[PDB]
Amino acid sequence: CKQRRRYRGSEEECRKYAEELSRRTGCEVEVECET
Numbered sequence: 001c002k003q004r005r006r007y008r009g010s011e012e013e014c015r016k017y018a019e020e021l022s023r024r025t026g027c028e029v030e031v032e033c034e035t
Contacts, residue, residue, distance in 0.1 A: 001027035008034040 007017050014033030021029040 001025075002030070003027065004030035004032065006032040006034060010035070 005017075005021070007014050009017070011033060014031055018029065018031040021031065
């Protein structure tokens with residue numbers, strides 16, 4: 001389970017979204033950061 005999402009917001013918010021998702025789910029998630 002290595003999935004990915006495209007998220008819009010601040011760089012930090014994108015990084016926070018990534019870390020939260022990755023620790024929340026026992027898997028690997030990748031995020032893309034748009035603004």
